[PDB]
Amino acid sequence: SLSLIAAHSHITGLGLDENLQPRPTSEGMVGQLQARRAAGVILKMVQNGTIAGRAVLVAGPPSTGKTALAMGVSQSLGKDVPFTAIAGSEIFSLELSKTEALTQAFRKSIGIKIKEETELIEGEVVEIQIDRSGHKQGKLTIKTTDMETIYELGNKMIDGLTKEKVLAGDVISIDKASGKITKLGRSFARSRDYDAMGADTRFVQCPEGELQKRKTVVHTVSLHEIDVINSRTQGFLALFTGDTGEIRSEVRDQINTKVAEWKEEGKAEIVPGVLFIDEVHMLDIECFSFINRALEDEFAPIVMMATNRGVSKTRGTNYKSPHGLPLDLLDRSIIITTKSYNEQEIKTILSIRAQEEEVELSSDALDLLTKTGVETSLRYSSNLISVAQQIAMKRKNNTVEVEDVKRAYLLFLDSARSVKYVQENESQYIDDQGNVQISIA
């Protein structure tokens, strides 16, 4: 995937053993042993696929691995298991209601693996002979790399051939169920015949193997995609534009019934996934009341929620809540907590980040960065690493040292020093009341 080195680019997954016992450092994660155990238990719950509609809350101080834990869960899940990560503010739209946005998010987190059986004949047509008066009759020859057979054509087949304007050297595919004819391309022997080629023309080889083939193909389509396709007459365009509107409830019920019928017949399989809502405290009370009932569904996915606020005010209400969330939602949610790191864990995290950013830190520089991290913040030192690397490179030195980190510390401030400077010079910065002294003398 197109990517650059990002904040969570080093997490290959939860470093869990066979017994769901975390390793001290593995797959790019350090510490948080209890939280990683809980995340692994939730991951195995997702993988089993029997339990439906479970809410998980991730709580802890900021910069403590909540989003890191979610990234690890996503990486462990891998592909073929949907994982929709959205922010708290993303659901607010001018087109969709909040309930509709949450419904679409929930349906995106469930995937349907559907099997379609197709029987086809493919080959390069060698000779076509058509006789017409009464109805017409004709014979046709199609060859493969190791087969050749002459077929007799009905009147409708001849009509289809004529309306497709098939000539010799063309590779075509016919569905014996409907008789529809699709022109794959032309043979290589006809390439020399022209100097400029039309937009439609394509040169393809002669297909190998048997002329008539049976094949089954599995497609991964989310529930939301099925709803959008079956809503309008061209919904698959809305799957890209996003102008889907508030899909009818009866459409969703029909799609649920259709998926159940397919699952009974064994041509569709359900692969439940994980819905991750970042910063759930930005949601409203209406959204939470919807989520409470949404989880009580057979098709409902497993919802992961990450919050950092303690006793804060729930949006849309006039009262404070234990995590910024109403008690009813907290009742139906199991909580995974995170713990602040010590010096050694911060040192290991900084070393991992330096390795990911291909920056060769020194021992003294690493110690200084660890001290700054424990004094101020982990993200501050993590961001200082690359700036120090650039300063060192400007000094035509291939390794970073204490002087480069010191210069990076001096140039780029943190939250504490910025607050100190804004408080020392309150008169030159605009305040809540709007007063500011632009003049100096």
Binding site: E127, I128, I130, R132, A168
Partner: peptide
């Protein structure tokens, strides 16, 4: 028919209910 005349029998049965090659192609 308008002069109170019956139509052709085969045409009647067809209307109640409703050799040489013409195209040959071969790759050289």
């Amino acid at each position: 028919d308008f002069p109170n005349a019956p139509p052709n029998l085969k045409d009647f049965n067809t209307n109640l209910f409703g050799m040489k090659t013409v195209f040959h192609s071969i790759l050289p």
